[PDB]
Amino acid sequence: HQTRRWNPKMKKYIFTERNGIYIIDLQKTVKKVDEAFNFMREVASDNGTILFVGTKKQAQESVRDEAIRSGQYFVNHRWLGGTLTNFETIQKRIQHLKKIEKMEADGTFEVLPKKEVVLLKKEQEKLERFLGGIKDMKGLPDALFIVDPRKERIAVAEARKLHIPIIGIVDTNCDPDEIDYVIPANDDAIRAVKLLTAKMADAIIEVNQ
RNA sequence: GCAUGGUUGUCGUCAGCUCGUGUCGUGAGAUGUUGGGUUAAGUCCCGCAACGAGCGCAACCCUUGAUUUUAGUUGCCAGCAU
Ligand SMILES: [Mg+2]
Ligand SMILES: [Mg+2]
Ligand SMILES: [Mg+2]
Ligand SMILES: [Mg+2]
Ligand SMILES: [Mg+2]
Ligand SMILES: [Mg+2]
Ligand SMILES: [Mg+2]
Ligand SMILES: [Mg+2]
């Protein structure tokens, strides 16, 4: 971002300074994204999965579209804590979701009273909003993808405690050590996030097809 | 009855009391149960390192307040006589 709120642990990746903000060197970025494409290719063809975490709005739409295109698993709304550690409780909740959806779609669509609208629809809508792509996550994600690491501390902490690789774009205002494998990019403009996430999904598809 | 098994005034019908899996602390512990609204209420919504849950609050309960069907003596009298 600006030259005030920045992390000195990323002075390697800054290059000169325009009037107002820092300027990121691009050659390091192209080397990093080539390496990231290679690693995503190495990891995708394993009958596993790759998780997408859309913290900010740009990330929201971008990761939703890219995951749907690639058929992967993603989280889009607020990341409720404990998905990668309380996975028992999360899977209980998603089993609840599947059962209620099945019964509402098949059985009767009318239990007994006029009490479906008051709670039994609003809570289902809210839970479907929060969970989203977890309804298909069979096991444990192999490599998270985060747009803004400093705006998603809970997810990176939960992944690092379970010790699974992390890939993500680190702006100048983040510490590039919590994420084990980094690409320096601006996570504030909708254009760049789309390009990077689409490249990651394309690499996954090309390797795993 | 201060060695124990089976109960009556008041705050006051006042809204509180906690567990599981998780995280944060060396530890006692904390979070959830804090914040902004809102309610008669921890009743509910949104954010939120937390996701659910049990006793409570609520509903199921009684009576009262309207109407339909079923049923007419000891109840009632409209049409009838008396
Ligand atoms: Mg940024
Ligand atoms: Mg004693
Ligand atoms: Mg007593
Ligand atoms: Mg008394
Ligand atoms: Mg008192
Ligand atoms: Mg500890
Ligand atoms: Mg309390
Ligand atoms: Mg409150």
**From the CA of A159, how many Å to the C1' of B44?**
34
**From the CA of A114, how many Å to the C1' of B66?**
23
- Placement of tokens 């990651």 in the chain: A200
* Residue A61, token pair as written in the block: 């739409």
Amino acid letter, A174: C
- Placement of tokens 């889009």 in the chain: A76
* Residue A117, token pair as written in the block: 């609208």
* Residue A200, token pair as written in the block: 């990651």
Give me the torsion for CA of A79, A144, A138, A75, rounded to 10°.
Answer: 30
Distance separating alpha carbons of residues A119 and A128, to the nearest angstrom: 14
In window 43-102 of A, residues with CB < 7 A from nucleic chain B are 78, 80-82, 85-86, 88-90, 93
Entry resolution (Å) = 3.1
- Evaluate if the CB of A161 falls below 7 Å from strand B: yes
Positive or negative CA dihedral for A176, A180, A183, A188? negative
A148 three-class SS: coil
Residues 6 or more apart whose CB falls under 8 angstroms from that of A86 comprise none
Angle, CA A185 vertex, CA A182 and CA A190 arms, to 5°: 130
Strand partners, A22: A17
- Cβ neighbours of A108 (radius 10 Å): 8
How was this structure determined? It was done by cryo-EM
Distance separating alpha carbons of residues A200 and A90, to the nearest angstrom: 27
Asked if residues A131 and A93 have their Cβ atoms less than 8 Å apart, the reply is: yes
- Residue A13 burial (10 A CB sphere; 0-12, 13-18, 19+): buried
How many angstroms separate the Cα of A164 from the Cα of each of A1, A11, A84, A167, A177? 28, 26, 10, 10, 14
